[PDB]
Scaffold this active site. Structure first.
Site, short mmCIF file in Angstrom:
data_model
loop_
_atom_site.label_atom_id
_atom_site.label_comp_id
_atom_site.label_asym_id
_atom_site.label_seq_id
_atom_site.Cartn_x
_atom_site.Cartn_y
_atom_site.Cartn_z
N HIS A 69 0.80 -1.22 0.00
CA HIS A 69 0.00 0.00 0.00
C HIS A 69 0.83 1.27 0.00
O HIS A 69 0.32 2.36 -0.25
CB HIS A 69 -1.06 0.00 1.10
CG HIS A 69 -0.55 0.36 2.45
ND1 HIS A 69 -0.27 -0.58 3.42
CD2 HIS A 69 -0.33 1.57 3.03
CE1 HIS A 69 0.08 0.02 4.54
NE2 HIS A 69 0.05 1.33 4.33
N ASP A 125 -0.80 -7.45 1.78
CA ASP A 125 -0.19 -6.12 1.69
C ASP A 125 1.34 -6.31 1.79
O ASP A 125 1.92 -6.20 2.85
CB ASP A 125 -0.70 -5.30 2.87
CG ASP A 125 -0.31 -3.85 2.79
OD1 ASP A 125 0.14 -3.40 1.72
OD2 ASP A 125 -0.47 -3.16 3.80
N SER A 223 3.63 2.68 8.36
CA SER A 223 3.36 1.64 7.36
C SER A 223 4.60 1.04 6.71
O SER A 223 5.53 1.76 6.41
CB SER A 223 2.46 2.19 6.24
OG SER A 223 1.15 2.48 6.69
O1 T76 Z 1 -5.67 5.85 11.52
C1 T76 Z 1 -4.99 5.12 10.81
C2 T76 Z 1 -4.00 4.16 11.40
O2 T76 Z 1 -3.12 3.72 10.39
C3 T76 Z 1 -2.40 2.62 10.87
C4 T76 Z 1 -2.60 2.13 12.18
C5 T76 Z 1 -1.99 0.94 12.58
C6 T76 Z 1 -1.20 0.23 11.66
CL1 T76 Z 1 -0.59 -1.33 12.11
C7 T76 Z 1 -0.94 0.77 10.37
C8 T76 Z 1 -1.53 1.99 10.00
C9 T76 Z 1 -1.17 2.65 8.69
N1 T76 Z 1 -1.88 2.08 7.54
C10 T76 Z 1 -2.86 2.82 6.94
O3 T76 Z 1 -3.31 3.89 7.36
C11 T76 Z 1 -3.48 2.18 5.72
C12 T76 Z 1 -3.14 2.99 4.45
C13 T76 Z 1 -4.30 2.72 3.49
C14 T76 Z 1 -5.49 2.79 4.46
N2 T76 Z 1 -4.94 2.32 5.72
C15 T76 Z 1 -5.65 2.01 6.84
O4 T76 Z 1 -5.14 1.67 7.92
C16 T76 Z 1 -7.14 2.25 6.74
C17 T76 Z 1 -7.87 0.89 6.83
C18 T76 Z 1 -9.38 1.06 7.02
C19 T76 Z 1 -10.07 -0.32 7.09
C20 T76 Z 1 -9.77 -1.12 5.81
C21 T76 Z 1 -8.26 -1.30 5.64
C22 T76 Z 1 -7.56 0.06 5.58
N3 T76 Z 1 -7.55 3.15 7.81
C23 T76 Z 1 -7.46 4.48 7.53
O5 T76 Z 1 -7.31 4.95 6.39
C24 T76 Z 1 -7.44 5.37 8.77
C25 T76 Z 1 -6.05 6.02 8.88
N4 T76 Z 1 -5.05 5.10 9.46
#
Ligand code: T76
Lengths: 276, 11
Positions: A69, A125, A223
């Site tokens: 990602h 991923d 990430s």
């Molecule tokens: O607040 C955080 C924490 O983010 C975190 C929190 C804990 C961990 Cl280990 C890793 C990440 C970073 N990864 C991301 O943010 C990915 C990037 C693409 C979307 N990602 C997600 O994490 C989605 C997910 C939503 C549900 C479906 C999968 C993607 N959530 C969000 O976009 C909210 C922003 N990220």
């Protein structure tokens, strides 16, 4: 020689919190890493604008492992190519060009798992990056080990603690230097019941339960970084997961999800030997 | 707030 740190294992010195990990084998709320604490930590860096993209890890002198990602994510129109990035190895400070310490490298080829699922849950991923020319190891640069079936079997157990590192957000300001946090692995049931997202066998979640008192988590910017564990059998560090996704950072009742590296090692082997 | 890296790598 993977997984043995020049400034620690090799001199027989323990880092300040590794004991917590070993005692369990029965970044938000983290702390500054010690120099040479995670010599495999790699920084994915964007040329223009110059910016931190993600974390990554050094698995050999020519290969880097990260989350798919970080390179391809249509919902955010993200789709980087070799020439858009720089890999910085040997770093501690987030923003400073660590002259004489860090090494900056160019990419020759990116490989994204053919079945990466960006449409639904970031299943598989994972991505590999072939550097143009081998990096030379030093006290601050050394690869982490990839787990074999046996190591994965005995270590990837609920309750066992792993360690995550990165320069990402401290709250849902970025840190001055590399942060580190040790987190316990969580039971699948609990991971499943904490979200609406469909969880697959290619993921695992980690973090403290709300009643556990202790806390901590990865966050944006983290990430692609490594979730590692120290084997109490041979004293090496093995990367068990890749920081993948979460819904918020350090939210009570929520947990970060990680790519299960072992489950995908066949693809990893395949690529590395098929393409050098 | 990233410090300027050497252009030799940017090329
Ligand atoms: O607040 C955080 C924490 O983010 C975190 C929190 C804990 C961990 Cl280990 C890793 C990440 C970073 N990864 C991301 O943010 C990915 C990037 C693409 C979307 N990602 C997600 O994490 C989605 C997910 C939503 C549900 C479906 C999968 C993607 N959530 C969000 O976009 C909210 C922003 N990220």
């Amino acid at each position: 020689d993977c997984g043995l740190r020049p400034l620690f294992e090799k001199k027989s010195l323990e880092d300040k919190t590794e004991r917590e990990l070993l005692e369990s084998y029965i970044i938000v709320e983290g702390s500054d890493a010690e120099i040479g604490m995670s010599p495999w930590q790699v920084m994915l860096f964007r040329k223009s604008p110059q910016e931190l993209l993600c974390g990554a890890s050094l698995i050999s002198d020519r290969w880097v492992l990260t989350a798919a990602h970080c390179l391809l994510y249509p919902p955010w129109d993200k789709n980087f190519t070799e020439n858009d990035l720089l890999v910085r190895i040997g770093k501690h400070s987030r923003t400073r060009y660590e002259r004489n310490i860090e090494k900056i490298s160019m990419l020759e080829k990116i490989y994204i798992h053919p079945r990466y699922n960006w449409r639904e849950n970031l299943d598989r991923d994972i991505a590999l990056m072939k550097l143009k020319k081998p990096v030379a190891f030093s006290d601050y640069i050394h690869p982490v080990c990839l787990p074999d079936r046996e190591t994965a079997a005995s270590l990837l157990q609920a309750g066992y603690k792993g360690r995550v590192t990165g320069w990402g957000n401290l709250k849902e300001g970025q840190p001055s230097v590399l942060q580190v946090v040790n987190l316990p692995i969580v039971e699948r049931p609990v991971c499943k019941d904490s979200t609406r997202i469909r969880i697959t066998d290619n993921m695992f979640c980690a973090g403290y339960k709300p009643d556990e008192g202790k806390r901590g988590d990865a966050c944006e910017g983290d990430s692609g970084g490594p979730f590692v564990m120290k084997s109490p059998f041979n004293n090496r560090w093995y990367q068990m997961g890749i920081v993948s996704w979460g819904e918020g950072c350090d939210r009570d009742g929520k947990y970060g999800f990680y790519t299960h590296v072992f489950r995908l090692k066949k693809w990893i082997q395949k690529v590395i030997d098929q393409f050098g | 707030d990233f410090e300027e890296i050497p252009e030799a790598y940017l090329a």
